[PDB]
Design a protein around this nucleic acid. Structure first.
Ligand SMILES: Cc1cn([C@H]2C=C[C@@H](COP(=O)(O)OP(=O)(O)OP(=O)(O)O)O2)c(=O)[nH]c1=O
Ligand SMILES: [Mg+2]
Ligand SMILES: [Mg+2]
Lengths: 555, 412
DNA sequence: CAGTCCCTGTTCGGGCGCCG
DNA sequence: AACGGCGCCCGAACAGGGACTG
């Protein structure tokens, strides 16, 4: 006979055709034995745990670690076999609140519900599926077995039920206090208002008593009444916010698992520290699949790490969101596919920063990557503030106009303006739209054998110029690119080039300025030196012009 | 007082589990206001996390409308109930709708809110309203009545719809009425004044039983086709003939009678691209014959109702967009071109959005189906912006391609 | 006509950061 | 040694289209 809590239960079923958990206990140290027998006794008197008998043919072990670095201990059940047989839940947590999205509030209070999961009831017909034994001695007393009447910590359905139950309890209070903002993340409650300090504590106590009607306690231990507030890993001040101090490890010999933690902290630091790069550090995590393997720091990864530590020296901070002012996002090119941005409303008062350094595609250009960074910032801004910022981009209006109007794919950038901060993004060459009068016409081609991997590449021109170059360990695609490279090497500043390679033409027409292929990079270098280049395509094996002639040479 | 029609998923399929994407501030505020009124009216109810199903939701404004409309992306749920709205209770497609002079599209989705939904099926209509900056967890609802945007809604209401439209169809035996999704397609050959007058009689006919005041007008008799055309120049260069042979060679996959013998003979040797080549007597003959074959229809091209429609779009530049609709490759059922749409010369995504909506509207009128689109755009670019410009209550299927134009096939 | 190859793309799961 | 959320950078597995060979 246990009392039913005021919180409405959540009906939890299991996957059909499956039963409950039947896993043997795990032998643990005697330190854990004297730290859980006292828990199952206190929770039994408080109605949070009921004792069962032989009519419950289930069992589940429970390993326990200490609480978040404090005097208390934490009990977590290994429901990994129960989760495999429990129904799936739709998570209602859609993201992480960011302090740059908080508005200015005169009064701020951060609460913390004590015993979050242990104050929300479990489904009545589901408590039987949570059986576990507690041996008082490691090898003497068999130990009486108990069950769970609330949400166990470790179950895959506990977080979703608590977040949904917490919302239903706050709904009547929020309806009675519309001007009060309540950021609800798990059990921590961020309460803010523009009321006076005196009247604010009044509504806080009203909220504390409202939650108490459902058995939710807000003890004075984690009650924050004055700045700086520690909320979501940040330091919240009345007019600014900052990340909690980030400590980077400084070792003499670096391994694989240490760089993974190093790049991780730098990613977390790049949300407010401008100009953080992790290109050369993450480049060390390629190929090697041994977490306990020493990796020497390259000269490029060492200078990158030294420049990151100096950024973290001077303390930085972000500001809060003002809906009355516009959102501005400015991007800088950091070189080698690296981009850094800042989002602000007033100049030099950054709400947050960030970086975009993803390299997608074998071949690309700065304009494509800038477009991708704009899309990343836009979606990030819609999550935090619900609107798109005005962009300040280091690309001329004329440059962008030339690219998007000529590209074969739909592409667009929201309302933006040019900012003159070098290095400016530009297109490094432009293919001609019509053939060039007076320029030599190169008919190029290349063939390769699938078996021997041997191939040829060359050209013939209207002036009688000709070349054939034998290649070893190549492909049909590589010889087609090589043929175009030969025509660019051996031509003047203006040249017409005829190929039958849809593969090669598709790469060059997209005006790439960087490539994972050394051959394509050499082709780009030649295309830049030229004054006019006209690429033309013809179907192969059709007796068309000099294409038929150069096809005989290389095949 | 209405028995709920039993609805079951296709055997071997589970309900939709699609994540909600971020919404702008004005869209969330619109949806919170709409869902509050629908909950007060019992159309939707709050649910918990024990419902593992989910379907995205956002808001749109139709053309020349300032009123927010709730739109659910039921695309995943629709193809998991395909044997319902196509085998059990299917809606026949009138072949004469495309022949009418004027066709008006009426929003009748609000009538679906009066029929209850099967209790065993309501869990698959779950959706989640997000919050700005994740201030609060997601607010989850599920539908208690027939939801807008679900292909099962017009199928169940079809029996109710027939009785409502029965007196009007007797009054006007020449008017063709087609129902697709939340819309009603009313076509007639009457004059513009006579047509709009009869449309208002149908509106009053529905009133005696929030977007019924709008009437998007179509003219399928004015819809055009964009054939493959060949350039006509006074002089031809080596480059001109190389492009012509490349275009005719690809066109031979559609018309097998196209020849390039007498034209490739003009390109004998290794000539400069800008060298002028006078067309021979036989080359004029072969080019004139090819121009006539491009006017002749393609052999054995007809619509198969059991196959899916596929639409490809090409960006041609300067506000020009071409498209082809087919079921089998090189067996196009329709080719067309759009120009000077909204966003021309400034916004590719708004134009591409508009083009997809026009092509889908035409497919609904001609065949009663929405095609699957092959969009010339990057996935991340489309998924960032397309809902900003969407003005339709349905959503077609689409995939993303990248085909560099080796030869301008549909627009020289 | 199939069956490969070459090349390039996306999907997903795990490493790490961070929150509770 | 647990659960859930989001982000990054990583590699393996997979899909898909042009092009050559039997
Ligand atoms: C930090 C943490 C948390 N949780 C779950 C449990 C309760 C809520 C909040 O955890 P908590 O605030 O740190 O402890 P809590 O149970 O609330 O007890 P109190 O310290 O608040 O009294 O999230 C978890 O399952 N694993 C974790 O590591
Ligand atoms: Mg707590
Ligand atoms: Mg070739």
């Amino acid at each position: 006979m246990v009392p039913i809590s005021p919180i409405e239960t959540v009906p939890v079923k299991l996957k059909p055709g499956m039963d409950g958990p039947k896993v043997k206990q795990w032998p643990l140290t005697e330190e854990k034995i004297k730290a859980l027998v006292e828990i199952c006794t206190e929770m039994e008197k408080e109605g949070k745990i009921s004792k069962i008998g032989p009519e419950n043919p289930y069992n589940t072990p429970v390993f326990a670690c200490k609480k978040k670095d404090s005097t208390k201990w934490r009990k977590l059940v290994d429901f990994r076999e129960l989760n495999k047989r429990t129904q799936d839940f739709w998570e209602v947590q859609l993201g992480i609140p960011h302090p740059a999205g908080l508005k200015k509030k005169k009064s701020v209070t951060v609460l913390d519900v004590g015993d979050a999961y242990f104050s929300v009831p479990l489904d009545e017909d589901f408590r039987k599926y949570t059986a576990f034994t507690i041996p008082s001695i490691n090898n003497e007393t068999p130990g009486i077995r108990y069950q769970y009447n609330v949400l166990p910590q470790g179950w895959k359905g506990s977080p979703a039920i608590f977040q949904s139950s917490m919302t239903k309890i706050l709904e009547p209070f929020k309806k009675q206090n519309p001007d009060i903002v309540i950021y609800q993340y798990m059990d921590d409650l961020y309460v803010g208002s523009d009321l006076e300090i005196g009247q604010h504590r009044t509504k806080i106590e009203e909220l504390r008593q409202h939650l108490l009607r459902w058995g939710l306690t807000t003890p004075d231990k984690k009650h924050q009444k004055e700045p700086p507030f520690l909320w979501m890993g940040y330091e919240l001040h009345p007019d600014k916010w900052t990340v909690q101090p980030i400590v980077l490890p400084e070792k003499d010999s670096w391994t694989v698992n240490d760089i993974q933690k190093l790049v991780g902290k730098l990613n977390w630091a790049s949300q407010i520290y401008p100009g953080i790069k992790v290109r050369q550090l993450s480049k060390l995590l390629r190929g090697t699949k041994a977490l306990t393997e020493v990796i020497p720091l390259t000269e490029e990864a060492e200078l990158e790490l030294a420049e990151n530590r100096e950024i973290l020296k001077e303390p930085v901070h972000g500001v809060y969101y003002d809906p009355s002012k516009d959102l501005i996002a400015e991007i800088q090119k950091q070189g080698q596919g690296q981009w850094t941005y800042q989002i602000y409303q007033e100049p030099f008062k950054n709400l947050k920063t960030g970086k975009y350094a993803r390299m997608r595609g074998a071949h690309t250009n700065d304009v494509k990557q800038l477009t991708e960074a704009v899309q990343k910032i836009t979606t990030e801004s819609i999550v935090i503030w619900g609107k798109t910022p005005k962009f300040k981009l280091p690309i001329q209006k004329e440059t962008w106009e030339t690219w998007w109007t000529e590209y074969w794919q739909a592409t667009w950038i929201p309302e933006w303006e040019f900012v003159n901060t070098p290095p400016l993004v530009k297109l490094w060459y432009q293919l001609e739209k019509e053939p060039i009068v007076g320029a030599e016409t190169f008919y190029v081609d290349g063939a390769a054998n699938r078996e021997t991997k041997l191939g040829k590449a060359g050209y013939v021109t209207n002036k009688g110029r000709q070349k054939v170059v034998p290649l070893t360990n190549t492909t049909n695609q590589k010889t087609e690119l090589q043929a175009i490279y030969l025509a660019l090497q051996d031509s003047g500043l203006e040249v017409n080039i005829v190929t039958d390679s849809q593969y090669a033409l598709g790469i060059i027409q997209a005006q790439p300025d960087k490539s994972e292929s050394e051959l394509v990079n050499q082709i780009i270098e030649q295309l830049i030196k030229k004054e006019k280049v006209y690429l033309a395509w013809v179907p192969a094996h059709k007796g068309i012009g000099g294409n038929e002639q150069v096809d005989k040479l290389v095949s | 007082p209405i028995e709920t029609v039993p609805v079951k998923l296709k055997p071997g399929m589970d309900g939709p589990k699609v994540k909600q994407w971020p919404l702008t501030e004005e869209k969330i505020k619109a949806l919170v206001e709409i869902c509050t009124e629908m909950e007060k009216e019992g159309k939707i109810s709050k649910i918990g996390p024990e419902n593992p199903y989910n379907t995205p939701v956002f808001a749109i404004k139709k053309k020349d409308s300032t009123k927010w409309r709730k739109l659910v992306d039921f695309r995943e749920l629709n193809k998991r109930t395909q044997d319902f709205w196509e085998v059990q209770l299917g809606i026949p497609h009138p072949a004469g709708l495309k022949k009418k002079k004027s066709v008006t599209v009426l929003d009748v989705g609000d009538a679906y809110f009066s029929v209850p939904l099967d209790e065993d099926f309501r869990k698959y209509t779950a959706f989640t309203i997000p919050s700005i900056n994740n201030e609060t967890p997601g607010i989850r609802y599920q539908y208690n009545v027939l939801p807008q945007g679900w292909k099962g809604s017009p199928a169940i209401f079809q029996s109710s719809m027939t009785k409502i439209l029965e007196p009007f169809k007797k009054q006007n035996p020449d008017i063709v009425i087609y129902q697709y999704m939340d819309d009603l397609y009313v076509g007639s050959d009457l004059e513009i004044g006579q047509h709009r007058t009869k449309i208002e009689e149908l509106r009053q006919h529905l009133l005696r039983w929030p977007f019924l005041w709008m009437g998007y007008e179509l003219h399928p008799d004015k819809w055009t086709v964009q054939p493959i055309v060949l350039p006509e120049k006074d002089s031809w260069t080596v480059n001109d003939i190389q492009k012509l042979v490349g275009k005719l060679n690809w066109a031979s996959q559609i018309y097998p009678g196209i020849k390039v013998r007498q034209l490739s003979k003009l390109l004998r040797g290794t000539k400069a691209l800008t060298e002028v080549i006078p067309l021979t007597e036989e080359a004029e003959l072969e080019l004139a014959e090819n121009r006539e074959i491009l006017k002749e229809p393609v052999h054995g091209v007809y619509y198969d109702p059991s196959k899916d429609l596929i639409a490809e779009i090409q960006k041609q530049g300067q506000g020009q967009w071409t498209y082809q609709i087919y079921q089998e490759p090189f067996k196009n059922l329709k080719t067309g071109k759009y120009a000077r749409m909204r966003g021309a010369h400034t916004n590719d995504v708004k134009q591409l959005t508009e083009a997809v909506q026009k092509i889908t509207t035409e497919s609904i009128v001609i065949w009663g189906k929405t095609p699957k689109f092959k969009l010339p755009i990057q996935k991340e670019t489309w998924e960032t912006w397309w809902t900003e410009y969407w003005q339709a209550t349905w959503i077609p299927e689409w995939e993303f391609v990248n085909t560099p134009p080796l030869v301008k096939l549909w627009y020289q």
